[PDB]
Amino acid sequence: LGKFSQTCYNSAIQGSVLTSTCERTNGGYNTSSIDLNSVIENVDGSLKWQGSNFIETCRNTQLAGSSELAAECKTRAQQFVSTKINLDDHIANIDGTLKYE
Amino acid sequence: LGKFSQTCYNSAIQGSVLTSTCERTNGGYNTSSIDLNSVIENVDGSLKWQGSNFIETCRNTQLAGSSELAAECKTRAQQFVSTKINLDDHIANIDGTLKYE
Amino acid sequence: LGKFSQTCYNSAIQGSVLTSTCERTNGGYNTSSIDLNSVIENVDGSLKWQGSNFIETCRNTQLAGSSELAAECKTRAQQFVSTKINLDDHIANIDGTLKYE
Amino acid sequence: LGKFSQTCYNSAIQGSVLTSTCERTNGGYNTSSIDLNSVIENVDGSLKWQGSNFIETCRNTQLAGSSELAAECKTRAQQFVSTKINLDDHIANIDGTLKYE
């Protein structure tokens, strides 16, 4: 996983389609495309990240007061935690060669 | 715009559907329903009004700087607003391939 | 959005495949199936929810000390937030019939 | 199991790939690489050792009560143990269709 702006170059937009040449995990580069048309929208003059259908991501829909739709809706925040795993658990030296066991 | 509640009564929400009994222009009442599923969305845990396809309603879509997408988008009131979105928010490089995350 | 156990019935599992008859959002029922094999795994004799590929969901992979793989990995916990939207914004009474404007 | 770090040196991780220089059984050293992407996963923000396919390594899969998948799964000691998982955790009813969320 890498940040678009930091690990890709020669980016281009044609219509709603984004193309860029990005670093591969284990070296070298790949050029690929993504259609932004379904993930970005125009809300009141502003580009924003398209949300989700409320029937998929909100529960307990109800009327509130005389005119409000109320619900409990899932967030989509991106949280990272620092983590480690000891490769000595399963990674061995078999006659000079790393192997999983 | 809107304001149905001013001339309706017995509104209810079931599922994604609003039902209400509303005054006819010349008098008397009519009960009707509307499915709110295509006009309201969940954006980051909040119910918001669904926006428009940005290719259809924005012009001059272009990459700007290292990671930004810029466009001039139409408001609901027929005006243009110059807007930027940071593609780094949700466009990731996964092993050399652009993927939304 | 409904909880499987609360809004479905006549559920069965055959092999890795879950079948059930579930409430539709706006009334009635539907029977569908889901293959649990790609989302559940056996970890040391316990069924657990399968995780994600660490290259898709973790960044900054590095070796820590002599034998540890270290990274910053995304969580998959999202809260539910109580939200409301005023349907009077865009829902109107047009001669006895609810319409979006 | 494992313990590569005891007889190896100049270890490094790049992307998902561990590289190390390891002692050969009959003396001398060899540098090799192992891709960790298929044996480690991100589970809830923690790096963990990947488990096995439950259909291949468990037996007697069935639904228990209204929401639980029950099985007997093989342990690293090669015996079967009783295990359950609450399908409510991630199996949702979306408008009548079972969907992982």
Swiss-Prot record, chains A, B, C, D:
Pfam families: CVNH (PF08881). Changing residue 52 to P: Protein is exclusively dimeric and has moderate anti-HIV activity. Cleavage, or reduction and alkylation of the disulfide bonds results in the loss of anti-HIV activity. One of its GO terms (molecular function) is carbohydrate binding. Belongs to the cyanovirin-N family. Gene3D superfamilies: Cyanovirin-N. One of its GO terms (biological process) is regulation of defense response to virus. Keywords: Antiviral protein, Disulfide bond, Lectin. The keyword Cell wall biogenesis/degradation does not apply. Disulfide bonds join 8-22, 58-73. In solution exists as a metastable domain-swapped homodimer which very slowly converts into a more stable monomeric form at room temperature. Under physiological conditions it is unlikely that the dimeric species exists and indeed the monomer is more active against HIV. Interacts with HIV-1 gp120. Its activity in situ is unknown, however it acts as a viral entry inhibitor, inhibiting HIV-1, HIV-2 and simian immunodeficiency virus (and some other viruses such as feline immunodeficiency virus, measles virus and human herpesvirus) infection and replication. It prevents essential interactions between the envelope glycoprotein and target cell receptors by binding to carbohydrates on viral protein gp120 and possibly by other mechanisms as well. Addition to cells must occur before or shortly after virus addition. Overexpression of this protein to provide quantities adequate for medical use as a topical microbiocide has been attempted in a number of systems including E.coli, Lactobacillus jensenii, the yeast Pichia pastoris and Nicotiana tabacum; see PubMed:20162270 for a review. Coiled coil: none annotated. This is Cyanovirin-N. Mannose-binding lectin. PANTHER family: CYANOVIRIN-N DOMAIN-CONTAINING PROTEIN, CYANOVIRIN-N HOMOLOG.
